[PDB]
Amino acid sequence: MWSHPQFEKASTGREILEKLERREFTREVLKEALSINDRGFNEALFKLADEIRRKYVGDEVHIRAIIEFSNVCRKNCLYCGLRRDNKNLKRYRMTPEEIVERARLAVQFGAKTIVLQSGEDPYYMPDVISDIVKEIKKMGVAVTLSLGEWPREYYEKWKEAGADRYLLRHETANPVLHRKLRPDTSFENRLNCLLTLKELGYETGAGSMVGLPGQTIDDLVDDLLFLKEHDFDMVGIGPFIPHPDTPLANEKKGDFTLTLKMVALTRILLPDSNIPATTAMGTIVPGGREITLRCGANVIIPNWTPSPYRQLYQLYPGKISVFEKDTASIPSVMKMIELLGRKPGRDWGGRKRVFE
Ligand X SMILES: Nc1ncnc2c1ncn2[C@@H]1O[C@H](CSCC[C@H](N)C(=O)O)[C@@H](O)[C@H]1O
Binds ligand CPS by CB under 6 A, chosen from 20, 227, 275, 295: 295
Least distance between ligand SF4 and beta carbon 93 (Å) = 13
Closest CA to 233 of 282, 298, 185: 298
Residue 294 contacts ligand CPS per CB under 6 A: yes
Longest Cα–Cα distance of the chain, Å, equals: 76
Applying CB under 6 A, the span of 94-102, 173-181, 231-239, 289-297 interacting with ligand CPS comes to 289-297
Q: Which does 240 bind (CB under 5 to 8 A by kind): ligand SF4, ligand X, ligand CPS, none?
A: ligand X
Cis link prior to 151 (omega < 30° from 0)?
Answer: no
Least distance between ligand SF4 and beta carbon 156 (Å) = 21
The H-or-E segment that residue 45 falls in is helix 39-56
Closest CA to 262 of 49, 21, 40: 49
Cα separation, 119 vs 97, in Å, equals: 19
Residue nearest ligand CPS, Cβ-based? 294
**206: three-class secondary structure by DSSP:** strand
- Residue with smaller CB distance to ligand X, 119 or 288: 119
Residue 259 contacts Cl ion per CB under 5 A: no
Cα separation, 296 vs 346, in Å, equals: 19
Binding region for ligand X (CB under 6 A): 79-80, 117, 119-120, 146, 148, 168-169, 171, 209, 238, 240-241, 243, 280, 315-316
Cα separation, 217 vs 211, in Å, equals: 9
Q: Which of residues 19-58 bind ligand SF4 (CB under 6 A)?
A: none
Rg (CA), the chain: 20
Q: Which does 70 bind (CB under 5 to 8 A by kind): ligand X, Cl ion, ligand SF4, none?
A: none
The H-or-E segment that residue 64 falls in is strand 60-70
- Residue with smaller CB distance to ligand SF4, 45 or 73: 73
State the DSSP code for 343. E
**317: three-class secondary structure by DSSP:** coil
Residue 289 contacts Cl ion per CB under 5 A: no
Residue 67 contacts ligand SF4 per CB under 6 A: no
Task: Using CB under 6 A, list all residues that contact ligand CPS.
Answer: 43, 46-47, 287, 291, 294-295
Can you give the binding site for ligand SF4, defined by CB under 6 A?
73, 75, 77, 80, 82-83, 119-120, 148
